[PDB]
Amino acid sequence: ENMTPQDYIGHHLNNLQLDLRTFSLVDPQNPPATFWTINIDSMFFSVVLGLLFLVLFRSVAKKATSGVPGKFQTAIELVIGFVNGSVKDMYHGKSKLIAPLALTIFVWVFLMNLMDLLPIDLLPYIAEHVLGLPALRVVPSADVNVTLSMALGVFILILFYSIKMKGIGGFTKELTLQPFNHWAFIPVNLILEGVSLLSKPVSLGLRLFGNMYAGELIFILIAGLLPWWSQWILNVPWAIFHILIITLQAFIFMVLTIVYLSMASE
């Protein structure tokens, strides 16, 4: 088997894609060029983890009793309390959206990051040999598209809340007049506040992507270059470090969503 180190790394860095015009699972050796080459891995893994999240929480919601809580129910009400406590800290308006939005963001991004800890060859190997798919990678949040999808959704909610509460006059006043106040500085202020506004969602998406893609690349590099006896002793410390990374990146995406929507509305 003529596996060079660079080629093993490359195949782990090759997405599985399908062109919607020919509607066929295309080969990674030669990549086609069109917007409609959906990344199969991203879609399937993201939607499956979201469904699992909803199924667990619903499996408690459709049964919950206000008596003595069980050992599983307690775990879900811990995270509910954690999310609601963080929302209650930073948002005081009445909106019913903010709290469930924070909940879904936290748990969904957590599970998506959790994919990164699994062994790099397991699911891709099963996908090629058992099924026959020509490529695979299993971390959804290690792809730009999903992270920008979430960031742009949060962007649209920021615009919705700013418009809704402030009205036509207030939002235009904040975009033009600040931070230099005088009407002589308005032409510069549109650029400064416009770029700040646009920076908020760009920051969200690229923070999450930059963490997760490079982490998966570290696992790929260890597996591809270094000999087995060193692969285990370098794989364990990176996993122990990346548990902290996955938790904090999910938490940061949640917290900054709350902060951005709070500053949009209040």
């Binding site: 730009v144 920076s199 940061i252 917290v255 902060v259």
Partner: protein
């Protein structure tokens, strides 16, 4: 030869400066977090919730730098 060479050189400079920026900024910010934890320890769960907010802003820009670094290496080649 030297077209593809210089792309990885550019990624090197980009990610190196980004590494300095993120590392030093969080070093300073977390040092102040620890000083505030040392003076009022039962107040840590609030200051930690402020630290993650500020730390998000600190890393936000080095991380688009890092993203374009790995873009230059793996996407442009």
């Amino acid at each position: 030869n030297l077209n593809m060479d210089l792309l990885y050189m550019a990624a090197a400079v980009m990610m190196g400066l980004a590494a300095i920026g993120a590392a030093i900024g969080i070093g300073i910010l977390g040092g102040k977090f620890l000083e505030g934890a040392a003076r009022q320890p039962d107040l840590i769960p609030l200051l930690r919730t402020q630290f993650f907010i500020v730390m998000g802003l600190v890393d936000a820009i080095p991380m688009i730098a890092v993203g374009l670094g790995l873009y230059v290496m793996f996407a442009v080649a």
